Amino acid sequence: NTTVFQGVAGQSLQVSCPYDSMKHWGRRKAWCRQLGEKGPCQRVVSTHNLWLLSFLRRWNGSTAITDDTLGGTLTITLRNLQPHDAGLYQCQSLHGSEADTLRKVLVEVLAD
Ligand SMILES: *[C@@H]1O[C@H](CO)[C@@H](O)[C@H](O)[C@H]1NC(C)=O
Secondary structure, eight states: OOEEEEEETTSOEEEEEEOOTTTTTTOEEEEEEEOTTTOOEEEEEEOOSSGGGTTSOEEETTEEEEEETTTTEEEEEESSOOSTTOEEEEEEEEETTEEEEEEEEEEEEEOO
């Protein structure tokens, strides 16, 4: 059961990944995109490298990430949604070599 997010193309879309603020305390977060089914997942952007500053927005081009570590809500903004921006993404909580999956989403688009 993934979840879906619909966006009008040319205007911005926000996705929210809720999580347990305590379970993932001190953990960096990342937003990545999927290719085909089984893999790979490729990192688009991660929250600030210093956890106390993860409330700072981070950008990879048109994609922004911000983390509310106290309330436990990660928020990704796809500014100016595009057709090619559509696809299957996930939010990740990182620890050591591994990453755990916080939420799994599709993005949809409509022109005009
Ligand atoms: C930023 O650009 C795209 C995100 O869509 C990705 O392929 C690339 O690896 C990103 N850069 C880094 C350093 O993660």
